[PDB]
Every structure is written in C-alpha cells, then in structure tokens.
Design a protein around this ligand. Structure first.
Ligand SMILES: *[C@@H]1O[C@H](CO)[C@@H](O[C@@H]2O[C@H](CO)[C@@H](O[C@@H]3O[C@H](CO[C@H]4O[C@H](CO)[C@@H](O)[C@H](O)[C@@H]4O)[C@@H](O)[C@H](O[C@H]4O[C@H](CO[C@@H]5O[C@H](CO)[C@@H](O)[C@H](O)[C@@H]5O)[C@@H](O)[C@H](O)[C@@H]4O)[C@@H]3O)[C@H](O)[C@H]2NC(C)=O)[C@H](O)[C@H]1NC(C)=O
Ligand SMILES: C[C@H](N[C@@H](CCc1ccccc1)C(=O)O)C(=O)N1CCC[C@H]1C(=O)O
Ligand SMILES: *[C@@H]1O[C@H](CO)[C@@H](O)[C@H](O)[C@H]1NC(C)=O
Ligand SMILES: *[C@@H]1O[C@H](CO)[C@@H](O)[C@H](O)[C@H]1NC(C)=O
Ligand SMILES: [Zn+2]
Length: 598
C-alpha cells in the first residue's frame, strides 16, 4: 500500500540524490578540465563521462515509474520525483547523445579558439576575443577599424559553425520531443514553472520598451555628432560596431561620447584601480568582503586553491568566457575568469561570486534542489551587489572615486550610464531566445535562418551589422551562449528581478526611502547590511526546493515578477530624457534595416 511505499520512496530519494551528486561531481571535473584546457584528449574525456552519466539518468527515469509518486501525500517527495523524470538531452538514444556532445564541444571549442589578424599588421594573427578584440571594440573610435574586427570575428565565430549548429537544432528538438515537450523552447521554459511566463515577459517588456526607444534615439543623435551623418543616419538602425560591444548588448563603453552632461563627472574607475595597483586577486577578495559584510558566507579555501582568476600565460587554448562552478560536494566551488583590472570586470567578478554564494547557500539541500529557484534567480544575485558597487556612494568609500560632486547633472550621467547597461540589454536578451525558440519550434525555414536573426535584432534593438550580410553568413553563434548552448532568457528575467531584489534590500538596509530626497534608489549601498543579507540567506538557502514565487516571498513577501522596481529606479532618467529628446527634436524609432539580403 501507499503509506509503506512513501516511506520507502523517501529512503530511495535520499540515497539517489547523494549518488547523483557524486556522479555529477565526476562529470563536472571533466568539464572543468576541458574548459580550463582545450585538447582533443580532454574533449573525449568530458564527452565520455557525460555519456556515462546520461545512461545512468535513463535508468533513474525508468526506475521512477516503479513508485506511485503522483499519489503521495508529501509535496516535497513529489517535487523531487518530478525533477528526476526530467531527462533533457539524456533522453536521446546512446548514439544520438554522443553525436550531440560532439556537436556541442565542436561549437564551444571553435568559439574559444577564434583568432584574427591585426588590422594594421597582417603578419600578427594571434588576436583573441578576450582580451585583444574586445579591447579594440570597447576603445577604438575608428569606424573602419571597428568594422574590420566585427567582420573578422563574426565570420570565424559565427559562419564557421553553421552545419554543427543545424545538427544541434535537430538533436535538441529530438531530445525535447522524447521528453514530450513540443520543442526545445518549451523544455527551456519548463524551468520557470509557469504556463503564462512568455506573456508575462511580453507585458513587462512592453512597459519598458518606450524608455529603450528614448535611450536609443538619444544615443543615435549623439553618435551622429561624433561620427557624422555618413556613418550614422538619423532615421536608420544604429550601426552596431559603434556601440562599444561586439554584440551591442551593453553600450556603457561609449558613455564618454554619449553622456548627457559631458562637463560633469562620469564614473569610470578603471584608471584609479590601475593606479592603486589592483590585481585580479584583490578584486575577488573585495567581492568576498562585500558578501561577508552582509553576514553571508565567506569563500572556502578550495575556491582560492582551485579557481583560475587570470588568463594562463602558456600557449594553451581555453574558454575565457567567465563562469562559476559547483562541484556538488562540500565547499568545492570555483570561478574561471580571465580577469582584467577594469570597472566592468569588477562587476563581472561580483556577478560570478553571486553564483558562488548561491552554491554555498543551498549545498545542504538534496542534489535535485541544488540549483536556482529559477535560472533568472541565479543570474540576479551578483548583479544586486554590482548595482551597489557601481554607486558613487560605494565607490567613494573604497577610494576609487575622487573629488565627486553629486549634483543633479552628475546624477543624470550616472543613471544614463546604468541604463546603457541595464535597459539596453533587455531587448538584446529577449531576442537571443526569441531567435532560438523560433528555430526550435520550426517556425523559420533553414534558407532564412540568418536574416531571421538580424530581423529580430532590428525589430527589438534597432541595431544592424556594419556591413551587408546574407544567408551565406551565419551570425548567431558569434555570441558565446549560442555556441555553448546556454539558455538566455535567464538574463532577461535577471535584469527585471534584480531590481526587485535591490529595491527590497535597500529598504531593509535603510538605504532607500521614496519620500526622502537624501535616500534615492540609484545611490543605495547595501555593503555591511546584515538585514539585506538575511533576506538573501532566507531565499538562497531554499535552492529549488520550492517554486520560485515561494523563493521570492522568502526574500520580500512578494510572489510576482514585476517591472515596477526597474521603472522606479530609472524614473528620474525617463522624465529628464523624454524632455531632452523633445528639446533637441530627437528622432525616435527606426526604418527597417537593409543590412541582410534575403
Ligand atoms: C510521452 O508520451 C508517450 C505517449 O504518447 C508515452 O509513451 C507511452 O507510455 C506508456 C507508459 O506510461 C505506455 O503504456 C504502456 O502500454 C503498454 C502496451 O503498449 C503497446 O500497445 C499500444 C497500443 O495499444 C502501443 O501504442 C504501444 O507502442 C505498445 O505496442 C501496456 O502493456 C502497459 O501496461 C502496463 O502498465 C500499466 C501502467 O501501470 C501503472 O502503474 C501501476 C502498476 O505499476 C498501475 O497500478 C497503475 O494503474 C498505472 O496504470 C498497467 O496498468 C498494466 O497492468 C501493465 O502492467 C502501459 O499501459 C505506452 O505504451 C507508451 N506509448 C504510447 C504510444 O502510448 C511516454 O512514456 C511519454 N514520455 C515521457 C518521458 O513522459
Ligand atoms: C559572464 C556571464 N557568464 C555566464 C555563464 C553561463 C554558462 C552556463 C553553463 C556552462 C558555461 C557557462 C554566467 O551566467 O555566469 C554572462 O554570460 N552574462 C552575465 C550577464 C549577461 C551575460 C552575457 O555577458 O551575455
Ligand atoms: C592540457 O592537457 C594536456 C593533455 O590534454 C595535458 O598534458 C597538459 O598538462 C594540460 N596543460 C595544462 C597547462 O594543464
Ligand atoms: C548572521 O546570520 C546568522 C544566521 O545565519 C544570524 O543568527 C545572526 O544574527 C546574523 N548576524 C547578525 C549580526 O545579524
Ligand atoms: Zn551568470
């Protein structure tokens, strides 16, 4: 009978979770070794261990049918069993799974191994994205130089893997259908446990979209004054190579030429960091300090012993794209980052340490619950601290910002700078998954795959390639997450919910009061706040033990994902910018791009 079985089921789950953690540890070590050191041998090792774990998962999913788990009284036991039924790629036949792994490593290794020739020196051909190409994209204001590096990178990181990407789409679809999802889009969306999640995001995006259009319009206007009308048109999409980022996902690198008040201070602490002799180690130690200051968990010795926080100086190939790793034991957590001493990198350090903190907070949970409440929660943690670190308030405390006067104009500059990262990113993030969803769902014919990408980038972000592209090119995989098969919606969710977390943490810290002019949201510093840390502890320690609205409720008593907080943060900017665009007769919106030939 069911009472006796449920008791047996509890014991079954307890043992199985511990077994799954141990088996996943082995897979994770092999994946770490490959990412840290790309070789044919490490690839083979990584993929063979994954195939072995996949085989075990199949047996697990099969064994769940021996339990009447849907009949059980315990919501907790039912939730754990449900988690185990979800095979993902491991549902594929043995041979198909092996082919998918080989396809995935082919794409990620291609991305990681991209090298281009110097614009001025065709003999020097060892320029990698990180740091060489990204340095040019972020710093150069020579539009032809920028266009050169754009084309070279997209051709090598994107177009080169079209056939592998096509096969990946086929196998991802096959896997999804074996799990009885319609496509990989539904498989990804399942992580958010909400059948209205897409509509919710459409509604939030629509509310914020008008603010994006104002920022876009103003940036385009300012770029015209810098580059001239031969390079930037008033009415067309912005040429994306001028936006300071390879994918135009964040525009903060061009703040010095588009800032509302160029005669007033604009926060850029990179120079001071270098002057004061900052190192990657110091940046991570400072991140550690921020977390512990909030009464959260200190980084364990394994982190310091085993992390890679600087680009290796030997000849080896590796994945330099920053990442945080859980090894599913106790206190074995690691970061791999090719750390540079810049302001932007200080934020990346805090982002990655947010992941690490989440790992530490939930490591006592059973294996199946050792992940984020939803993928967006995991991405949000570090960014909440980054919002605080980025404030003039905090940066003055740590001696990185000197002789700063926070008048009305300096505040607008700072808000605009933040928006160049936070608002600009929203349409970008949405398009990454809108694109892949449309491919997964079979909504775009193979003949139209590349122009379908640029169509979305045009429709949502109002940006376009610097040169004419066609279906002979394939540009999507030039973005890491697309080559590496990492779901992107997590970042759209994060950029919305991080402001919900930040607003609440700031209120708990006594750092934000909407009726107090001396306590504005955009200058809140949660450093040293045990009350803010307590909220994080309450939420993060849950892991995935409960549906995400329960995790949000543990933080601040709310159960709904909302664009209220992000709009509240930027409201003073919205008011000022709307007026400024009217004052300067700024054209808003854009004509359809001519840069992808069908
Ligand atoms: C995705 O969706 C798929 C459906 O589109 C689904 O595939 C189905 O899974 C079913 C398993 O749940 C499976 O059902 C079995 O069918 C057997 C006979 O199938 C043959 O004939 C069919 C035509 O009539 C064909 O379509 C098939 O291809 C086969 O040729 C049955 O023999 C079998 O039965 C046994 O099991 C049931 C279930 O028992 C349950 O558990 C306890 C006992 O442990 C019961 O007390 C309880 O009541 C409960 O029912 C017993 O009742 C029975 O006595 C037998 O022991 C069973 O019905 C089905 O064949 C399969 N395919 C199709 C096309 O339907 C996938 O599983 C889904 N995938 C995922 C990941 O969810
Ligand atoms: C730097 C960061 N890395 C990823 C890593 C994703 C990942 C998942 C699984 C395996 C390898 C890498 C992360 O979320 O930490 C990142 O890609 N981020 C942060 C914000 C937006 C997004 C971007 O830069 O596109
Ligand atoms: C990289 O891997 C190779 C074998 O694939 C190994 O011999 C070598 O020690 C590794 N290099 C480094 C720097 O760890
Ligand atoms: C730190 O957290 C613990 C529980 O994790 C709590 O009991 C303690 O009160 C906190 N310290 C402070 C100063 O709030
Ligand atoms: Zn992240």
């Amino acid at each position: 009978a069911l009472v006796k079985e449920e008791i047996q089921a509890k014991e079954y789950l307890e043992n199985l979770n511990k077994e799954l953690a141990k088996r996943t540890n082995v897979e994770t070590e092999a994946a770490w070794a490959y990412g840290s050191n790309i070789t044919d041998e490490n690839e083979k090792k990584k993929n063979e261990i994954s195939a072995e774990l996949a085989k075990f998962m199949k047996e697990v999913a099969s064994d769940t049918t021996k339990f009447q788990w849907r009949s059980y009284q315990s919501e907790d036991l039912k939730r754990q069993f449900k988690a185990l039924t979800k095979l993902g790629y491991a549902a594929l036949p043995e041979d198909d799974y092996a082919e998918l792994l080989d396809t995935l490593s082919a794409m990620e290794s291609n991305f990681a191994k991209v090298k281009v020739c110097d614009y001025k020196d065709s003999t020097k051909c060892d320029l990698a994205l990180d740091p060489e190409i990204e340095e040019v994209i972020s710093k150069s204001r020579d539009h032809e130089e920028l266009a050169y590096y754009w084309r070279e990178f997209y051709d090598k990181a994107g177009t080169a893997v079209r056939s592998q990407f096509e096969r990946y789409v086929e196998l991802n679809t096959k896997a999804a259908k074996l799990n009885n999802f319609t496509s990989g889009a539904e498989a990804w969306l399942d992580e958010y446990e909400d059948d209205t999640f897409e509509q919710q995001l459409e509604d939030i995006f629509a509310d914020i979209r008008p603010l994006y259009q104002q920022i876009h319009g103003y940036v385009r206007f300012r770029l015209r004054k810098h580059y001239g009308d031969a390079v930037v048109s008033e009415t067309g999409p912005i040429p994306m190579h001028l936006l300071g980022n390879m994918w135009a996902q964040q525009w903060s690198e061009i703040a010095d030429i588009v800032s509302p008040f160029p005669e007033k201070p604009l926060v850029d602490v990179s120079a001071e960091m270098e002057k004061q002799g900052y190192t990657p180690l110091k940046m991570f130690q400072m991140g550690d300090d921020f977390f512990t200051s909030m009464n959260l968990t200190k980084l364990p010795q394994d982190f310091w012993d085993k992390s890679i926080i600087e680009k290796p100086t030997d000849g080896r190939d590796l994945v330099c794209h920053a990442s945080a790793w859980d090894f599913y034991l106790t206190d074995d957590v690691r970061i791999k980052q090719c750390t540079r001493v810049t302001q932007d990198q200080l934020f990346t350090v805090h982002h990655e340490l947010g992941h690490i903190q989440y790992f530490l907070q939930y490591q006592h949970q059973p294996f199946v619950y050792r992940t984020g409440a939803n993928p967006g929660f995991h991405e949000a943690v570090g960014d909440v601290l980054s919002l605080s670190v980025s404030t003039p308030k905090h940066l003055e405390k740590i001696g990185l910002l000197k002789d700063y006067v926070r008048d009305d104009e300096a505040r607008i500059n700072q808000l605009f700078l933040t928006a160049l990262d936070k608002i600009v990113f929203l349409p970008f993030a949405f398009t990454m998954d809108k694109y892949r969803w449309s491919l997964f769902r079979g909504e775009v014919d193979k003949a139209n795959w590349n122009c379908a990408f640029w169509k979305l980038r045009d429709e949502y972000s109002g940006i376009e390639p610097p040169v004419v592209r066609s279906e002979k090119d394939f540009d999507a995989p030039a973005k890491y997450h697309i080559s590496a098969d990492v779901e992107y919606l997590r970042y759209l969710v994060s950029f919305i919910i991080q402001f919900q977390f930040y607003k609440s943490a700031c209120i708990k810290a006594g750092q934000y009061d909407p009726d107090n002019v001396e306590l504005p949201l955009d200058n809140c510093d949660i450093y040293g706040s045990a009350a803010a840390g307590a909220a994080f502890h309450n939420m993060l320690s849950m892991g995935a033990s409960k549906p995400w609205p329960d995790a949000l409720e543990a933080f601040n008593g709310e159960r709904i994902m909302s664009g209220k907080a992000i709009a509240e943060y930027f409201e003073p900017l919205r008011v000022w910018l709307e007026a400024e665009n009217i004052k300067n007769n700024v054209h808003i919106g854009w004509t359809t791009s001519n840069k992808c030939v069908s």
